[PDB]
C-alpha cells in the first residue's frame, strides 16, 4: 500500500477569529431615517430566519473570555451611540449659570439665561432637573449650579427620535466565518460543550443596556447558571442567568413633559416641563425574588461548599455604577439596589426605590456626555430582570460567611450575559488527506 497528498475542498475545519461582524434585524420600516440608535436600516436586514443546523457528534471547546465579540460590540455600540448623537444637538450653549429651588425629594425646579434662535436675546428659560444633573459652581448659593459634565466634559442631546429602545441586533459572521452555538443550557463558557450547533448569525442578542442586573436577556434550563472568567479571582465579575424570569415596572410618578427651546436656529433642546412630586419607584414583590435567590445561593454553594451566603449593596463608588441602571423610553434610572440586595441565605431547612438622571456618562468615557431627552410621558418600564452581575467579597474571610455585592464591573460583561453561547470562528477549507490518484 502507498499514498499521496490529496485535498477535499470546503471540509469543516475552524478556529477562533479577530474577524469583523455585521448587524442584521427584521426591517422595522425599511427607511434609513427610522428614528433609532441601533439599526435604523443603516444596518442591512439580512434574513431574520436563523437557518441554524445541528453539530451532531461535533464536540467544541468554547471560550467566553478570549472571545472577540465582547470588545467588538463594546467598540461598535459606543460608535453607534456617537453616530446617532453627531446628527443631533451638541449642547455647548447649555453649560451656564443655573438657578434652582427645592420642591416636594431631590427634583430641583430651575431657570437660566441662554441664547434663542437669535444670537442676541438672553431668553429666560425653565426646566426641571433631578438633583444628580448638577453640582454647585463654587459655593452653597441658590443661583450657583452648573451641569455635572461641565467640570471636564461637553454634552449632546439626542433628537427625541434616536430612541434608545433596545431593538434586537443579530451579529452575522461574514462568509468563510461562522458562529457556533453551545446547544445546551447546562453549560458555562469555558471548556467543552457536548451538544452544539452552527448559525451564520446569532439568535437575537439584546443590545441589552444593563448596568448591574441583566435585563431582557433570556433564561436557562436544568439549573440556575453561573459564568465567570476565573471564580478564584474574587474581584472579577460573576454573571448569574436565572432559570426563572422576574419583572420590574419602574415608574416616574410625576406628570413631566417635553418643553422645547431653540438653543440656536437649528438646535431644538428639550427642557423638562412639570405637571404632587414623588421619587421614582418599582414594584417587584419580595417573596418571588427571595426564594429565587435561595436557589442562586445553592448554585454558588455548588462551587463554594456549605456556606451561609449574603447579597449586600453596592457602595462607595460612583453612583453611575453603584446603582442598578437602565433606560426606559428615553430617560435613565439609577436605583438604590440595596432594597433587593440586603439578604441572607442559610444552608439548613430554608420593591426598589430609585432616582432618575438626565445627564449620563455612558460607558464611563471622558467627554461625550449625553443629556437624555425628558420624555413626554408618566414613564413606565415593563421589563424582565433575568440575571445578576455578582462580585464576591475580596475578603477571603476564611470559611464561615463568604458573600457578594452586585456591580457594574464592565459593560462588556453586561454584554457577556447573552454573548456566552456564541463562538465566532473562521472556516479553513484546506482539507489535506492521504488518498491515491493520478492526474486525469
Amino acid at each position, epitope marked *: 500500500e502507498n499514498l499521496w497528498v490529496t485535498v477535499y475542498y470546503g471540509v469543516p475545519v475552524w478556529r477562533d477569529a479577530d474577524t469583523t461582524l455585521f448587524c442584521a434585524s427584521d426591517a422595522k420600516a425599511y427607511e434609513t431615517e427610522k428614528h433609532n440608535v441601533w439599526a435604523t436600516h443603516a444596518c442591512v436586514p439580512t434574513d431574520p430566519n436563523p437557518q441554524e443546523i445541528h453539530l451532531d457528534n461535533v464536540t467544541e471547546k468554547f471560550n467566553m473570555w478570549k472571545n472577540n465579540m465582547v470588545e467588538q460590540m463594546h467598540t461598535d455600540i459606543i460608535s453607534l451611540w456617537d453616530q446617532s448623537l453627531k446628527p443631533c444637538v451638541k449642547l455647548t450653549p447649555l453649560c451656564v449659570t443655573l438657578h434652582c429651588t427645592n420642591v416636594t425629594e431631590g427634583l430641583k425646579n430651575c431657570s437660566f439665561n441662554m441664547t434663542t434662535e437669535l444670537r442676541d436675546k438672553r431668553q429666560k428659560v425653565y426646566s426641571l432637573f433631578y438633583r444628580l444633573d448638577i453640582v454647585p459652581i463654587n459655593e452653597n448659593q441658590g443661583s450657583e449650579y452648573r451641569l455635572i459634565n461641565c467640570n471636564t466634559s461637553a454634552c449632546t442631546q439626542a433628537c427625541p427620535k434616536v430612541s434608545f429602545e433596545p431593538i434586537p441586533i443579530h451579529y452575522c459572521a461574514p462568509a468563510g466565518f461562522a458562529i457556533l452555538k453551545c446547544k445546551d443550557e447546562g453549560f458555562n463558557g469555558t471548556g467543552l460543550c457536548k451538544n452544539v450547533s452552527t448559525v451564520q448569525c446569532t439568535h437575537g442578542i439584546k443590545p441589552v443596556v444593563s448596568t448591574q442586573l441583566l435585563l431582557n436577556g433570556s433564561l436557562a434550563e436544568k439549573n440556575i447558571t453561573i459564568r465567570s472568567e476565573n471564580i478564584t479571582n474574587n474581584a472579577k465579575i460573576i454573571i448569574v442567568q436565572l432559570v426563572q424570569p422576574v419583572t420590574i415596572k419602574c415608574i416616574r410618578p410625576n406628570n413631566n413633559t417635553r418643553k422645547s427651546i431653540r438653543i440656536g436656529p437649528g438646535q431644538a433642546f428639550y427642557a423638562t416641563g412639570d405637571i404632587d412630586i414623588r421619587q421614582a419607584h418599582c414594584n417587584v414583590s419580595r417573596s418571588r425574588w427571595n426564594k429565587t435567590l435561595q436557589e442562586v445561593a445553592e448554585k454558588l454553594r455548588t462551587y463554594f461548599g456549605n456556606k451561609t451566603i449574603i447579597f449586600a449593596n453596592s*457602595s462607595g463608588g460612583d453612583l453611575e455604577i453603584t446603582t442598578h441602571s437602565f433606560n426606559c423610553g428615553g430617560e435613565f434610572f439609577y436605583c438604590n439596589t440595596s432594597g433587593l440586595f440586603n439578604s441572607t441565605w442559610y444552608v439548613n431547612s430554608t420593591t426598589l426605590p430609585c432616582r432618575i438622571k438626565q445627564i449620563i456618562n455612558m460607558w464611563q468615557r471622558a467627554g461625550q456626555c449625553m443629556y437624555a431627552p425628558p420624555i413626554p410621558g408618566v414613564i413606565k418600564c415593563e421589563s424582565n430582570i433575568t440575571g445578576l452581575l455578582l462580585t464576591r467579597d475580596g475578603g477571603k474571610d*476564611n470559611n464561615v460567611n463568604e458573600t457578594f455585592r452586585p*456591580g457594574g464591573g464592565d459593560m462588556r460583561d453586561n454584554w457577556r450575559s447573552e454573548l456566552y453561547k456564541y463562538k465566532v470562528v473562521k472556516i479553513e477549507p484546506l482539507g489535506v488527506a492521504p488518498t491515491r490518484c493520478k492526474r486525469r
Partner: antibody
Amino acid sequence: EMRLEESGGALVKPGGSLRLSCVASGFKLSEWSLMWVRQAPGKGLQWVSSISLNQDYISYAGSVRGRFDVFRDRTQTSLLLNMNKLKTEDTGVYFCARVHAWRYFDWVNRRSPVEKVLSIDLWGRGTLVTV
Amino acid sequence: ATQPPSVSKGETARITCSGVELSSQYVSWYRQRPGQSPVLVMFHNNSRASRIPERFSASDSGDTATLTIAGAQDVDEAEYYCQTWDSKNYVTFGGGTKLTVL
C-alpha cells in the same frame, strides 16, 4: 532566622528629606512587599503607608503620606522609602517586616471587592528617626 | 478600632481588639519586647507565632478580633498590638498594651 533590615538614618532636619531602603537577609527579596512602621517614640505602632510588592501596587496612607514617595526598582534592594518635608509626625523607629502575601492590588475600592491579600510575616531591626 | 489599654504569675493572657465593633477578615495582632522589633503572633490562622509554641488562637465575641493567648505561661513577654488594611487603600492599627505579671 531571616532578618529584615534598612539604611542608617539621621537626626533629620525638621522640613528636611531622607531615604531608607531594604538591606534584609535570609531570602530572595523577590518583590515581597515593602513594610515598615511609624513606631513613634514612647507610642505603640502605626503604618509606614500602604505598600508595594512589584512596583505600582502601593498607595499613600490616607492623604497623610502624600509628602513622601515609595520605590522597588529593577535592583531588588531599592524596596525604598523616600521622605520629604519632614514633620515631627514622621518620627519613630522604622522597623520592617516580610509580608505573608504575593499579589497585585486593585478593584472598585473604598469598601468594595479588592481581593489582593496583605499581611505581616516575621519582623526585624530598624532605626529610631527624630528631628 | 482598638484593644483596651495586669495579671498575677501563673495566669494566661486574653485580650480583644476592636473597640465596641469590628468583624470579618480585619483581624491581626503582633507582640513586642521594647527595644526589639514587633513580633508576629497571628494572621488568618495559618500564619502563626514562632515562640508561643501552639498556645494561642483567634476568637470573636460577635464584635472582636482576639489575642486568645490562653496557654502562654511564657507570660512575662506581654506587650501587643493589632493591625489590618481593609479600609480605603488604608493600613490600620490597634493601639496595643503591656501586661505586667509580678
